[PDB]
Design a binder for this molecule. Sequence first.
Ligand SMILES: [Mg+2]
Ligand SMILES: [Mg+2]
Ligand SMILES: [Mg+2]
Ligand SMILES: [Mg+2]
Ligand SMILES: [Mg+2]
Ligand SMILES: [Mg+2]
Ligand SMILES: [Zn+2]
Lengths: 49, 149, 82, 237, 129, 100, 27
Amino acid sequence: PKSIYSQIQEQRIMKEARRRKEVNRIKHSKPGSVPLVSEKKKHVVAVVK
Amino acid sequence: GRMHAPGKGLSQSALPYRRSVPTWLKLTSDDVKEQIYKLAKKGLTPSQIGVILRDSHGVAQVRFVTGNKILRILKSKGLAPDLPEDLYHLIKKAVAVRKHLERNRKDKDAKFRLILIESRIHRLARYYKTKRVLPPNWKYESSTASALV
Amino acid sequence: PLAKDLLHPSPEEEKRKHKKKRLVQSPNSYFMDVKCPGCYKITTVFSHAQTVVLCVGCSTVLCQPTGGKARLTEGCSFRRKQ
Amino acid sequence: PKYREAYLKECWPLVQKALNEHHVNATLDLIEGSMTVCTTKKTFDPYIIIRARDLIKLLARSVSFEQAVRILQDDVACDIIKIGSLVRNKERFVKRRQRLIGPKGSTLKALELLTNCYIMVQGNTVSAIGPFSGLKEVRKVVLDTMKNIHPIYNIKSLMIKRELAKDSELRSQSWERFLPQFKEYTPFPPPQPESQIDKELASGEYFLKANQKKRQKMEAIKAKQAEAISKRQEERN
Amino acid sequence: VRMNVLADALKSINNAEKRGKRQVLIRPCSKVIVRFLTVMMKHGYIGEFEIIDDHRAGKIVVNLTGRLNKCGVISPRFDVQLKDLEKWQNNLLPSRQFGFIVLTTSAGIMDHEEARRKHTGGKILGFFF
Amino acid sequence: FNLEKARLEVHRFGITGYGKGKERILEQERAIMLGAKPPKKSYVNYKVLQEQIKEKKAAKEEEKRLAQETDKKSAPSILSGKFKNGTLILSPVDIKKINS
Amino acid sequence: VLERERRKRSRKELLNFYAWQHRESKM
RNA sequence: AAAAGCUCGUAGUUGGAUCAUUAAGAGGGACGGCCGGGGGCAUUCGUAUUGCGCCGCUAGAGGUGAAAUUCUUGGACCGGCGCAAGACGGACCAGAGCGAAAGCAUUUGCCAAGAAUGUUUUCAUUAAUCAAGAACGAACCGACCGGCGAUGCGGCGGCGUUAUUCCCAUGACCCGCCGGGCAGCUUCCG
Ligand SMILES: [Mg+2]
Ligand SMILES: [Mg+2]
Ligand SMILES: [Mg+2]
Ligand SMILES: [Mg+2]
Ligand SMILES: [Mg+2]
Ligand SMILES: [Mg+2]
Ligand SMILES: [Zn+2]
């Protein structure tokens, strides 16, 4: 439906805008300066254990 | 929401959540007060006194260290200003515009700006009369304004 | 839009927002300790200073007021406080 | 302009071919964004470079290649008219420019047929190419429209001029009848008036409680009684 | 300008529920708002909410469930007797099987059904359904 | 001198420059606006139809770019005292009707 | 920078703002 | 009850939180460096056009569809040199900027004002909308949450290029981010 379709198109533009702004900063900035995190372990804040 | 400007600015100070003085602060409540007195004896406005303390002596907030506001401290010692600071600055601006406007007859814009400044002066004057800061007979006159400040 | 939790913003989100638009207001200015050359006395200077700062001991010009953060003199050493 | 850089690039091989027949060189400078034409030693006709200068100017005005190189023939001339300076207002300039092209381009095409000249409207310039008599007419009519005189008058005027031409008689006689006919300024502002709230503040009535104003009214009434007593004594006397 | 932080808080909640949001930020906070949000919360219309304590008037973050259609405020704030409570319910809410009218009384800020139990009336605050 | 007579004969002479074939389509268009019934648009294959729409659009932004460089409800609302800006206004004369 | 500050001293250092500035001036 | 404008502003209306406190993504003021065809007073330059003075040359010059009014042997027109006068400020010039609107474009000096940004400065509700009144005045719909690109100003942070500071000056470019503007393309809600 149009309600679901518009939301999917909107969220795709958002993620592409972040990635372009991500590659611009990492191409310039020093490799040690910017940490790299896996998309799997991006969403884990911590583990109490 | 500026009264005479359509744009809405958001530039202002944002106080921190903490109200406690920093540990590094080596000045006491008594020591700060005499610095306020010396700056006032030099002829500085209370707004300017706070700026000097912030810049050089690391006094982020006088109210948090001494427990009193700058203007209340000055009144206790007796160094009370004749006229409120914001009112005095506004009257000072009106005289300078009026003095310029006498030598420039064709300056329509200065005429228009003079009206807005006088409008703020009248509004603030009525408010101060309600708070009994001014006697209920004080009036702002163009000839008198030069002698006022 | 991307989903954001108003109760628990991430540290990089709340550092990026305007100081008035955070959950709780917090200024971006700070106080620093400066050590001028010529004499090694320590002076505390506000980062967004609006007046020229002179050393108490040697009366050397430390910083110059600007539009935003004050610019320090060459050869000085500065430490963020707290 | 930048938008013309793309078109010129593919059609550059053709114009160098055209100019090489008369031994005149041309260069399309991409970095400077310029077109330059210059003669050589093999060239023998002095006037062709003046015609070569006109060709590059027309191409810069978005004139198509087929019409642009046509002026290289001696019989065809060219005239670029700048109309931007005529009207200060942009909105008026747009409206009168649209009046020139007319509905569906009819007035532009009608002028094109009568004048036997190719006319193109682009930006603030109008480019015309054709016989010398034709270019004179175009400048008269196009400039006239910017002067707030309707184009349909001049187009209809040209048609009547055309029909009289076929008539051999009265050529010497004038065509005027046959052509169609239509508190001194004070620098100081006035003092701001006082609202009602002001006056009782000046009088001090605002702070005073409702315990002494009523007494003042009683005293005023009492004074009027004495005046009445004075009047009743006077009439009694 | 604003006086009725209750009205603005209810307006922002009402607008977001129409827009399908999951959480809302309402400011400034007030104890009147908190008591109003408690009454709506007890009937399962909003859900748990947080009060963020800054040093200036507070802020509230409210979770949404999507069961609320229209919430508003009542300006006249007349005094209503208990015997006249039934008339006020029908003439405001669409039906009698759902929705409540919030009142402020001497005993506290409570909805219409509870006021019948405590045999008290008061001033009308608002409604929701 | 009448403009309405003059405008049309100028318009007719203008069109002839385009060509005989262009005459037919423009003269057809004119009478349509004066009240003629349009001819039926020919039925075409949907796959062919969809490609034509994409090409017709694709020309449009290019024309838009060149211009830049040169420069019915089924049912009414269920919700309609008077309610405005989040506030319910109750007239006293209506309130007596509410009480009665 | 020191010269620029010294020219500004006239504007920010007032001579008739406070109450005491008036009373010892009248003496 | 059958189908002209724009701003200020009086009355009125209308106006945060806390149980005196706080210092509002309410408002006023100061302070910091910048910014703008904003306004006023002087000052100055630039072509074009027109007129005048002198030199050179000799029958025409101008205008039209064709002519006709006009100017010319006391020299018209054309070519050169200089002087004077009235307007105007191109190209650079952008859907850019500024101003309450109408409106605003050469250079330099002077006077006053202002927006935004920066602020851990100050006062502490001083506010909003408005008939009356006052200043100025050419010649689909609704405060409808958002997004994406550019663009103008201020600020923050940064791998690298590019210049460099007696005075004057500390920038040009690229990337990320925060505000307030001039506008586009889109969505969401009533
Ligand atoms: Mg400000
Ligand atoms: Mg504040
Ligand atoms: Mg300033
Ligand atoms: Mg300036
Ligand atoms: Mg300027
Ligand atoms: Mg910038
Ligand atoms: Zn030192």
